Amino acid sequence: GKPYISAKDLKEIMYDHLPGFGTAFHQLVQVICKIGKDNNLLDTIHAEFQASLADGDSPQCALIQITKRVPIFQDVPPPIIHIRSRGDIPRACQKSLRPAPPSPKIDRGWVCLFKMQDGKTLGLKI
Structure with a gap:
């Protein structure tokens, strides 16, 4: 797993396991990746995304959990x-x-x- 990921590559990973297009979760991925890029937190966000999926969370749940776990979103x-x-x-x-x-x-x-x-x-x- 990549220790260092770009905003473009993280967006692509997150989009890869979302259904549909232009959903509220697609918008959330963009919001998270922009905030991550601007605050040098993409790898923390990526780590939490992976850890949530490993817990059996849906990708949508994983994104919700990011917003709750990672301090920048407060x-x-x-x-x-x-x-x-x-x-x-x-x-x-x-x-x-x-x-x-x-x-x-x-x-x-x-x-x-x-x-x-x-x-x-x-x-x-x-």
Whole structure:
């Protein structure tokens, strides 16, 4: 197993065992890999991903566990993603949206915040 992994390669590993496309978990992989890359934590995240799968977790469960175990996901907010309309959010995410609370936390299931033109913001939530 690779002691040192790039953000591109980690994304690919995580995508390799997810069903579907444009799901809330695909978005979560992107969020985790960006935060991992920016904070030099990709190998910690990769280690936790592997350890969770070895415990018999689904890859989706493994991603949830990453958000709960790895401290950075308490340290950093869900990223704001600016979008032009509701239709820009992938169809597999459309039934995973809620109005954002004041202080949404990644470890509570808030993947990212889509900020739309009317000033309103829909959080993606698992």
